[PDB]
Amino acid sequence: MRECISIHVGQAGVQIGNACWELYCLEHGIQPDGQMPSDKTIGGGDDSFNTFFSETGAGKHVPRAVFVDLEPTVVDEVRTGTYRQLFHPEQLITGKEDAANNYARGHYTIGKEIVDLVLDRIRKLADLCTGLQGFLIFHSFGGGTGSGFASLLMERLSVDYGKKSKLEFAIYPAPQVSTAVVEPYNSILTTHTTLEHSDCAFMVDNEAIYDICRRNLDIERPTYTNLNRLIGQIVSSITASLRFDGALNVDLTEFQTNLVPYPRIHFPLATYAPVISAEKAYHEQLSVAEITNACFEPANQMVKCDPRHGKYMACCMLYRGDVVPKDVNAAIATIKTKRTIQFVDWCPTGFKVGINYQPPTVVPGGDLAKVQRAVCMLSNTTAIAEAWARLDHKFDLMYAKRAFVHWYVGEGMEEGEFSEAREDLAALEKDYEEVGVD
Amino acid sequence: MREIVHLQAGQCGNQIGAKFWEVISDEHGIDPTGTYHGDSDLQLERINVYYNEATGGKYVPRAVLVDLEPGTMDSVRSGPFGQIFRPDNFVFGQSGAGNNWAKGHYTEGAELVDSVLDVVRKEAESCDCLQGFQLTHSLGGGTGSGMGTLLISKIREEYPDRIMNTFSVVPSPKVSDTVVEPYNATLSVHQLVENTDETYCIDNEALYDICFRTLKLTTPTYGDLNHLVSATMSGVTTCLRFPGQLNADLRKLAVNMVPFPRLHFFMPGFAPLTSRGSQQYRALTVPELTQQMFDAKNMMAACDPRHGRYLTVAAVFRGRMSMKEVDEQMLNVQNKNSSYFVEWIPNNVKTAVCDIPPRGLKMSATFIGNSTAIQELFKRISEQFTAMFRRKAFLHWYTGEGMDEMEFTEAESNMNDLVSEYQQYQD
Amino acid sequence: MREIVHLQAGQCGNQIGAKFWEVISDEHGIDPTGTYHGDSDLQLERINVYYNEATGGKYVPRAVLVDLEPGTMDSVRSGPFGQIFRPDNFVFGQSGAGNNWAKGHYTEGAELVDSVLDVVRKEAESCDCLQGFQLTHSLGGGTGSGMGTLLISKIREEYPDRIMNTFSVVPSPKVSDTVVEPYNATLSVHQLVENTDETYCIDNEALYDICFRTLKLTTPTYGDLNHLVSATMSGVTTCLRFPGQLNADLRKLAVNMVPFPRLHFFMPGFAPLTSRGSQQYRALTVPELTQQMFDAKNMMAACDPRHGRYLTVAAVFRGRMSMKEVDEQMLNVQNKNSSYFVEWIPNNVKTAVCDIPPRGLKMSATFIGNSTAIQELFKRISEQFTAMFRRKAFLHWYTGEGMDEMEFTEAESNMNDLVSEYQQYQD
Amino acid sequence: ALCVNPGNPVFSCMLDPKTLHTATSLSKAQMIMYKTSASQYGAFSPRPFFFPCKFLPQEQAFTEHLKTTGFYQN
Amino acid sequence: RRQREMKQDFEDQMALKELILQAAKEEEETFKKAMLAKFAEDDRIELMN
């Protein structure tokens, strides 16, 4: 039927898996014990959880995700946390040595003897599932552990399972802020290894997420938790099509087919319009008009891209809540009549609407809004190549003076793979204006 | 699990490690007798990173004391934490060193290296998988440089895959007590640069000035200085034992601090230091910590990098912080002095935050620095060495010990090479 | 049921047996008066292996004390447990020893064998079914050599179907005190090899070294050394007296330890040896026990088997342990030194687990080994015998009692044969 | 006294830690000295309040009765 | 009623194992308490001699 398996690689990708699963357990009312109250929803594990959890005949919801990490610290608290009894002990795949921000160390030195266990994990999950539309891979380009380790597995899951989808979510490195200078090393290695195997890659940046917090959420001092709920709400919305129904229902296969125009480039942008503080929604009103203006406003996107600097190709809006097509198609018709929005003449239509009648709901102890009308904005534009244009001039200098090379060549690697990436990005960027040029 | 075995070398390290080890056991809350008072779950968990557990709730420190003179060791053993130190870990020689590097490197070391290697390996199988080792000693110390240079050589071939941390103190630039000290340091650093992967550089004169600046106590003890450096050395060790989102491994750190192999010398940096009245005239805020964190006076290592420029900077923050207040301040300091970094590398800052504050103070941090301020250091000793070697003062001893002028020739030639390489890359 | 009767001979074995015996009583908890203070059922249950019971709760030892000099026996009788031993069991002759092998072997023993054989057959009729005999004596001891060699020949024909255990000590290689001792040893070891089936080899020089090593108390008493060797013999006997899935019979062990008939000479091996602070500085774990168990410094019997290789190794473990840790520790040593055993036999280890910990400690073990380290022993005496047989020193005495050089020729010729025999099968 | 040699150069602690704790109406009293950045993820107990007022799950029992078996065929 | 029964006996079986586990850790430290006491008395008997 309609189910998938999520993947959370690296200490970077662990807390988001917690927060989302914590988020996911709320709307289903999942008690921390692991069972419902006296009311009847259990059975052969077939109900709203069956797409996400496995509440088998034993009666305990088993999340359909595997947490892989190499540094036992962070996994040790979470297995001593609150929902640890809900987590399968060794789906929390832990490791004993870090990748030390080294992409090759995380791909070669240690990934060999653990993937077979992980391959053993996925096959046990593969047999119990029925439809398994695809996978939800959560990672990071600047992965101290996520980068190297995920690269091997995504190769191996591709060769044995090449007929299903693989959905990729990753935090994109900050454009001008760099917490590491080996980050340009691994991130460029991740892209060239994934573009020929990754199905759909979705990226985001934290600084813009922070900007929203003190722009409209009015929080000058947020935390991870606020950020994790926001992206957790984002993945919750895209999975709401699976959990709920709507006027029409759309699946990731429809997204992939309609979003990516041509091979290689599969990197759209995500946005959530009704991001607002509690008091603003209190004495103001939300309707399809302003939220659509908000969702297309150049500063409400979480990626440092200027839309008027580029041109639009893909437009996907996922309406989760009480909306009606009457004002919807009228409002978007005005958006088509809008002159600033510059779609490519290649696509007369590029608009993918997904209606869901369930309103997004507040989380206990949360900071989000009180949403009756919401949109999950998936869009792709030519204004993105400058990020890699930012990456390459960052990379070419540091490669020219061959920084840190004694480290990487010390562990048995060479420059030929690094040379491969520079023309690959050159190939990637030149496609971007080629599809840009009409 | 991954752990560390520590080495107490040189007679200063006797003061260093003694203060250092109590600075650890105390804040895990073990009594001097050794019976741990179970109070903190996390320190009960991550005590195994440095200690093994004996019977009676007593965690044995996994360190080794080496010396030649019994009296220093007897004082340490008679200290409040001698009972937490082990007789088998007390290894020593039957000789007075004469504060001679060569005697401690060729004559006296010959019959002691065997036993210490037997001792250190016995703890090696006792543990499972080390990150490496750290060595508290001095580059200006006679027996320590004599012993340390020998050991760092031998430990390299046995375990060439671990972390060989070195903790050494630089003598007073003005006035060095030992007159043959420039000879000792020059010999030692020759092997040090070839053997070490990291080097902590600390100087006493700056420590005295810090007392004139913030301590203002006029008459402290040398142990108080040990207390300071142990606190700094404790801060860098907080990462490994403490949880919280910061990457602790020195190898997560070493690749981030070391651009090229020849870069081993690094300078410390510490967080709030406060005088009498300012203790209640200070509003602890991340900026004012950061302002105080980056102060030319709160420098304590060698000298002012104001003379040169900054290569790489890395600060670890200990307490209840968040990603933002460290984020904008890095942008603030980035824009405050953008030119005084090197255009070779942008974003040369690597930050880590420990959510577990020290026992009593909340808002704290530590800084490790690699700037272009070491040229003054070894150029200083360059005129010294050349001056004494110009007329080979204090030499008949070492020739009687069996040494020759040739060994020094490449040793200074190696040092002069480090002078150029630091100069070429920055200037 | 199957029992054991002890033999106490030689002026040394006069000392050891009492120390051995008082330990066993202290192990079993009998007061010096002899009225067992019943506290453990199992030690109550299996005291019958060595003791008979008199009237009123008095366990009489089934041991035989034999000597010539009264003052030793009077000191023994006035000892803490002389009241536990019988005047019936106090047999002696009417002559001084003079530390001559043949006087006790040909002259004095002739009128004393009748008495002891009557005594030992009386106690033989007292007991129902025997494993065999054990003899505590010395090979370098004049009275023990003469009587022991006599009785072992006599006991063979009367009961050739039992266990002829022998406990002898090798005199100090550096100095034998007794200058005629190499004659005494060569004569005895000649007679021993044909008549014996087991021989314990112990040398005192290692014991002094161990005292400097772990006892560390500088000045011990020889009785303390007896307390050391008795623990070795106690542990090998804990197998028989105590329950647990350990196969205890010496025959169960003998066929396991003895590949071929002439292999009688064996080395003991004992478990945790601990110094003043290490009693509460020791993490008593099966890995560290095996480490100290397989330490060349823990060697106490003759010398380091490092010079040779290992034929048969067998260690009995005493305490609350499990099969798996002893199994993995067993496989570690195979991987540790695979080349230092013989390719003749792999898996040369025999293991038995006594679940009953001793009184005073829990984790303990005993080791019995047959390694190729005895060549140095008799080859040492070979140069001794040849040089003294070269000019027949001190010979007019032995010609006086009725001996000839011809007996010496074959005794060393037999000795030379065993020199080669140990050589060929390993080298 | 849980002090090394109090008034030491770096800051020190003297007060009894076991009384430095605060609680929330939906949580338990916790040690303020040792509050970590990760324990917030499940710290609070839930109320029936922050739950949606509507539930429209997907019921598939009638599906699986005919999923478990092949469809009719001639 | 199959499921409710199998599930309820489980935490009962769960309840049974930590109680023998806590019984295991309490008894070992008493011997640990005992041994240090024996290490206490041996020091003080070394004192008078």
Ligand SMILES: Nc1nc2c(ncn2[C@@H]2O[C@H](COP(=O)(O)OP(=O)(O)OP(=O)(O)O)[C@@H](O)[C@H]2O)c(=O)[nH]1
């Ligand atoms: N995805 C994710 N990213 C984070 C999180 N916290 C900080 N980040 C950012 O994401 C990056 C984390 O990547 P890494 O440091 O390589 O983590 P890792 O690959 O799992 O290996 P380690 O260095 O040992 O932690 C950092 O550079 C941060 O800027 C988080 O909780 N999740």
Ligand SMILES: Nc1nc2c(ncn2[C@@H]2O[C@H](COP(=O)(O)OP(=O)(O)OP(=O)(O)O)[C@@H](O)[C@H]2O)c(=O)[nH]1
């Ligand atoms: N322990 C200790 N060392 C000090 C102190 N002040 C300065 N030092 C220096 O620390 C140095 C390192 O000690 P060691 O390496 O053990 O010196 P050594 O090999 O025994 O020979 P010397 O350097 O001549 O003392 C010494 O050379 C001293 O000059 C102090 O107050 N205590």
Ligand SMILES: Nc1nc2c(ncn2[C@@H]2O[C@H](COP(=O)(O)OP(=O)(O)OP(=O)(O)O)[C@@H](O)[C@H]2O)c(=O)[nH]1
């Ligand atoms: N009792 C005892 N015997 C020792 C000691 N040290 C070495 N020995 C030797 O143990 C040997 C065995 O004693 P016996 O067999 O009774 O000696 P013996 O037949 O009376 O004749 P001698 O060997 O000359 O004394 C002696 O020869 C001593 O040389 C010791 O400390 N105590």
